[PDB]
Amino acid sequence: QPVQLKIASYGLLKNLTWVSLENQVPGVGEVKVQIQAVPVNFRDILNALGMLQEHNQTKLGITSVDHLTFGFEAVGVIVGVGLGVSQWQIGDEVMVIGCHDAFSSFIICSPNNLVAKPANLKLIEAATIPIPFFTAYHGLYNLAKIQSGERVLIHAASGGTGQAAIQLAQFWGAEVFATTSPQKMAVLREQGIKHVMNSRTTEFANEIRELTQGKGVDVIFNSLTHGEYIQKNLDVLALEGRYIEISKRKIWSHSQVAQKRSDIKYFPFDLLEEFNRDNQLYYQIWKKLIQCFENKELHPLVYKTFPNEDIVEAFRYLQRSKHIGRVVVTMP
Ligand SMILES: NC(=O)C1=CN([C@@H]2O[C@H](COP(=O)(O)OP(=O)(O)OC[C@H]3O[C@@H](n4cnc5c(N)ncnc54)[C@H](OP(=O)(O)O)[C@@H]3O)[C@@H](O)[C@H]2O)C=CC1
């Protein structure tokens, strides 16, 4: 039977429940997609604990917990195409990007939220691509315009977004500086990274200064904003350096960054907010990425799989944050 992931109250992961999902028909300009695998995102956990209640009320129409759905991306198969849509047909194997209800048996979404799956990949492999690689690409290339020979710092680089940025930075000839937790350090060293440091301490700043002779890095790809992490990031940022902030939680404003370092370009961005302004964004990024995956120059991320029945433990596993890469749920 068709189902949707819901929570009857905020604060505890235990109450994540698959509730009956009523059939929906794709109207004009709409596509119906049969969901086959869904990664758990960091923001999914935040919502489950009820930590974006204002954000969800202001920027979206979520007034109560009963209106909350889960899932920001997926892979699946087109089962219904509404009128007006010309680029899609039933049977097309697609990745979904930027929906809010991917943890459902079926979703109705725009054809602008869909890209073609690379045919040489498995469905489950392709599920590791959308948010990580589109966020990494937009931040590093679209905004920061990183070039070869440049040095880039990627924080918490064992996660989904950090792992994609690693692949992109190296393929673009940049020199990667990574930080991760101690028990993940070997794996990242073994991924092909010369400079692996601790994401859990602020002492990375001093280490970077020494490895670079005061220069620091031209680009930071950052998602850590607690304590004195932002100030420490500014210290390691070179003259004219570029600050990609993807946190979306308690970030510095443009003048606050200008107060400290006027030379640097500050790039705070929310990917789905960027699609809101330009509905072509996913299409363009993917056009610049699909050939790399086709020619096996870029690869799916490392992932662990959970069945849908164990959704709670899939969420808990991402919450404990001991993973490298992606956590992916298969659907029934
Ligand atoms: N701006 C945008 O459009 C997007 C925003 N995001 C945001 O980016 C962030 C990362 O995304 P994603 O990679 O998918 O999430 P993940 O859960 O995969 O990554 C989180 C990583 O942070 C590190 N970490 C955990 N706890 C701490 C801590 N106390 N101090 C320092 N580091 C810690 C861990 O790595 P380690 O053990 O190596 O430290 C973990 O792997 C999230 O906040 C997410 O909401 C994500 C995608 C799109």
Same domain membership, residue 296 and residue 264:
no
**Contact, 272 vs 251, CB < 8 A?**
no
Strand-pair partners of 286: none
Q: Of 238, 269, 300, which residue constitutes the final position of a domain?
A: 269
Domain count along the chain: 2
Same domain, 312 and 331: yes
Cβ atoms of residues 81 and 27 within 8 Å: no
Resolution in A: 2.3
**Inter-residue contact 160 to 133 (CB < 8 Å):** no
Give the SS3 label for residue 305: strand
| Residue located via tokens 């590791």 | 128
Instruction: Compute CA distances 259 → 109, 225, 253, 256, 296, whole Å.
Output: 42, 17, 10, 5, 44
Task: Tell me the residue range of the domain where 155 lies.
Answer: 129-269
The C-alpha atoms of residue 116 and residue 128 are separated, in whole angstroms, by 14
Residue owning the nearest CA to atom 18 of ligand 1:
159
In CATH, what number is assigned to the domain containing residue 243? 3.40.50.720
Looking at the fold, whether 276 and 256 belong to one and the same domain comes out as no
Beta pairing class for 3-7 and 16-20 = antiparallel
Final residue of a structural domain among 243, 269, 295: 269
Does any ligand 1 atom lie closer than 6 A to the CB of residue 98?
no
Answer yes or no: do 139 and 252 share one domain: yes
Nearest to 36 by CA among 326, 305, 285: 305
CATH number, domain of 90, equals 3.90.180.10
Dist CA 24 CA 242 (whole Å): 44
Cα angle vertex 196, ends 189, 286, to 5°?
Answer: 75
Looking at the fold, whether 175 and 113 belong to one and the same domain comes out as no
> Where are the strands (E) in 184-274, listed by range?
195-198, 217-222, 237-245, 265-268
Indicate if ligand 1 lies below 6 Å from the C-beta of 318.
yes
Measured CA to CA, the distance from residue 285 to residue 60 in angstroms comes to 25
- Method for this entry: X-ray
Residues 4 and 103 in one domain: yes
Check pocket membership of 184 for ligand 1, CB cut-off 6 A.
yes
Q: What angle do CA 142, 147, 151 make, to 5 degrees?
A: 110
Looking at the fold, whether 153 and 235 belong to one and the same domain comes out as yes
Tokens matching residue 279? 């509905």
Ligand 1 nearest-atom number relative to CA 160:
13
Instruction: Compute the distance between CA of residue 135 and CA of residue 144 in angstroms, rounded to an integer.
Output: 12
Among 133, 199, 315, 318, name the best residue to mutate to test ligand 1's pocket (greatest count of ligand atoms within 8 A of Cβ).
199
On whether both 193 and 289 belong to a single domain, the answer is no
Nearest CA among 183, 110, 155 for reference residue 245: 155
209/288 same-domain check: no
Domain termination site, one of 227, 243, 269: 269
Together in a domain, 145 and 212: yes
Residue 107, judged by CB atoms within 10 A of its CB (0-12, 13-18, 19+), counts as: buried
Backbone angles phi, psi at 151, to 5 degrees: -100, 130
Looking at the fold, whether 97 and 144 belong to one and the same domain comes out as no
- Whether 63 and 25 map to the same domain: the answer is yes
Angle at 29 between CA 75 and CA 36, to 5 degrees: 15
